[model samples]
Target: STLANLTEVLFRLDFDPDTAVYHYRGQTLSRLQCRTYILSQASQLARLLKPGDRVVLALNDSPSLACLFLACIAVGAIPAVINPKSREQALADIAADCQASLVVREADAPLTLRAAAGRPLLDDFSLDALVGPADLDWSAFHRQDPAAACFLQYTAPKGVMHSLRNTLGFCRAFATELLALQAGDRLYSIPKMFFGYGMGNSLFFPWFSGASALLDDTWPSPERVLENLVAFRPRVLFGVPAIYASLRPQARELLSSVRLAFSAGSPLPRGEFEFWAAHGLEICDGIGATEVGHVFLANRPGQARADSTGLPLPGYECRLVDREGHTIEEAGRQGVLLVRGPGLSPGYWRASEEQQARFAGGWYRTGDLFERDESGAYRHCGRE
Candidate 1:
């Protein structure tokens, strides 16, 4: 019912209702209109993946990858989105590390994935050519529940340690909180696919809420992104401090249509917030990661206080403690933030000890440093 509730909100919405847009080779293809491409290739996805199993997604910025991800989601499976630019051996190594059953790659992937011979690989576009669903209803692709272990992504590096999370439930959280989302709002995000911010803002947040996302494949570059903002006239622009700082000068004229903007992936400096506020944009700040999932610490548009990450959301709990694990109760003392929330990851791949260290008596040691003020607002001092 949770997953169903999420998908219904996405597909049945009046604004920004397209599933996704495959932006590739200078052409944009509608996610819903390209069933010819999606259904034909879904079988390949189904072949390499199964319910509750993790599928390694290896592809570039294309609609096919999006189709592959949703097709797996349709059957209650999880797709671990990896950066396609990494070396083939590197990507395959990660796949083996996660023990994914299959690795799906684009037909013309820039990286070599052949060495991962043991794992199944499919060309996203070729597979799309395989499913001809002249009569297939796109609605049937929606699955009510995302399998228990719905998605997998590496956190620390090397895949020696990785995070496993609930895919459907995670997306549902975004759908619920992003209720202000309307049909025609457009979003532009900077985080890459492998990174949690990229996954949440670019993929789940928009799709689960029936909004469209403008994804830029090339990172470390904000020029193309700035151009797209001017052309698309996106209503929502999401980014971290770095992206905002880079686009500030041109943003007034190019991004004048923005209705809301979000800053996350790190602490937002008060100085930058003050500068952005003058742009006629309500710049709200927060903290989030691939580990705990979506934006859990954002300050609402008009309800923000200076120098603080707002209080926890509906299903989250937090505690501040010293290194020795003692609770720091009084305000003004800096310490670590440990949390227990629905969005928290279940654990690292298969390491019980590592998992135990993160979860002490059901609380996750967030590894982030913060402090509480006399006003009860939580302030992030820095990272641990």
Candidate 2:
């Protein structure tokens, strides 16, 4: 019921029924069309899948990929999102770890996967065909327990399992405390969709807030990104330090229409931030990882601090501890950053020792090191 409630909460957003909220490569989908696709795909999947089945989605960025993820959730099937560029061994390892029953990949799956245990690989293009009959009963598939596992994320050799409760809670809290974005706002993310950074900010954030997103499957290049920026003129641009650095020369002209820019994945150089600032675009530099759903600390608009990661978000607790595990209360001392919030995942799948070591009494050991200055701004030190 919790997972079902999550879907209802997202679907309840007052999106303009006729607005084409998602702009993909030469195609667009209205709010009503998106809802229809999600439900129809879910119906098709539910027809064949037994309760508690696990599905793997391994494909490049596309509107269908996004819909498939939601469809998996709609039918109570756990969807494991994996990088499409991964090698055969890594793919096999993840599939084995999660006990995935089905894998959905692009038409031309790499030859490398041929060496692994051959599970049926569903072609991504067939997703459109799977949009079942209109008369399919939605209530027939609505019998899942609220506390069921909603999704899986394969970060490394291990997988992270997030319950419906934690995932939805994070989405709601993130949209409220940080973004507060609304309709008419457009987002363009430079990174691919599967990565947590892009998944949260680029995909889920915009959809939940009645905003639209521009999705591009092209492997990110400076020239390609700049061209799209000039063409689409999205209000918010989600990028990284490297992307911002690369766009320094074109910032003034290319970013003229952008209202806000965000940087993550690594520390943003002061020079790069200053460059964007000089061109009238402010960069909100912050740090977040897969352990936490999305960003828990960030530089807010009009309140950025020099050479710092800004402040912890509302509704989240933060702490720092030294190498010996003692809590570090003094300012200007480096220690591992600890975060606890509703957004955090349940922990690594089937790895009890890792779960015990990383998650303690609700706090996630971020492994990333940081130091809080006297002004309450967190400065990135490095990884532990």
Candidate 3:
């Protein structure tokens, strides 16, 4: 099964629905809480939404951000996540583009919430000022609607732009993959929630895995991250080349307990990989995009191929096809990488025209260049 298909099983097949999410802000919430919060927010959101209404969410670290996203999915509203920097412009575009009815903001971060969406600040909102708000019931909301589009992603012109979905089916697959994550494993990631990897690795990964995730919200300082690592004793660490590069000196001290180091969101030089590995940390690197939902082909420790993205994960298949849609079919021959899988985004937000224009047949054009080995292992090449 692809990623989303797997998540559906967890929501349906699991005997218990309890899991854990440790926020970088220093609080823990249960999986039930996660779902409940989403439902509750969705209930509140429904008051402002009509059918096909688009909603954009912008705020910093909050216990409610993840659930709010889930709520958008439940309500069939398009939830567009934007970086705080681009919040104003992003909201303007999404509101205009999707004909948005409601714009959501977190009550926790007062300054950020107000500046971006231009709504009455959450602090001033009476719902948050009240002692006990009513809860949301999922039974009233239709979560399994087949055509609901949950996420709004935008790719930049520098080949770095994409908007994606959080299909119920895809969520199930991602959750199941996370279930394999052991309890007590501490995950770390940079603070670029606008990117899917940072969101999944820092938030969703631990949320579904039943583990504690560590986040230091203030710019992810290397010294601070290392200090937190030493104090928290993370078993799994996720960071980009930038963080690893900074930790080259103190990596040994902070990484003493780390068994797996994940590198994504950018390329990691082989030298950096070797440096961390020298400190007893095994590096897992892969090619993932916002359009892919999360990491589809990460190299797990002891199973990684140096300087490569390892292999296509179990539920997905990939190929290198030219612009004509013909598979390259040779070991060293490179072409535009194309992939079809559940983890792949359903489609871009409000880009039906561009979506139709770029999609070659049914497969999404990744725009990335890659090659396949004789053994079917996938490796990253430059962009086509």
lDDT leader:
2
- Candidate 3 residues lying further than 4 Å off, grouped into runs, are 1-19, 32-37, 105-132, 135-139, 156-179, 323-325, 352-355
- Model 1 Cα RMSD, Å? 5.1
lDDT of 2 by residue, 158-216 (tens): 67777766666676666666767778688888877778878876557766777878877
Ranking by lDDT: 2, 1, 3
lDDT of 1 at 12: 49
The best-first sequence of candidates by TM-score reads 2, 1, 3
Q: Write the per-residue lDDT of candidate 3 for residues 1-384, one digit (tens) a residue.
A: 122321222234333445555554445566566665655655665555554566666655444555565565555565566555454565576557655555555433411233223331112223333323545454345443343354566553112222223333233344355325675566666655556666676655654556657654355677677777777777777677788888878866766777767777666778887876677777788766666666666565577767777775557667788767688999977888877666666565555566545555656677888877887777778886
TM-scores of all candidate predictions against the true structure: 0.81, 0.91, 0.80
Write out the backbone clash pairs for model 1: 15-183, 16-183, 40-130, 40-131, 41-127
- Native-referenced Cα lDDT, model 2: 0.73
Indicate the worst ten consecutive residues by lDDT in candidate 1. 110-119
The CA lDDT at 215 in model 3 is 50
For model 2, the stretches where C-alpha displacement exceeds 4 angstroms are 1-5, 110-147
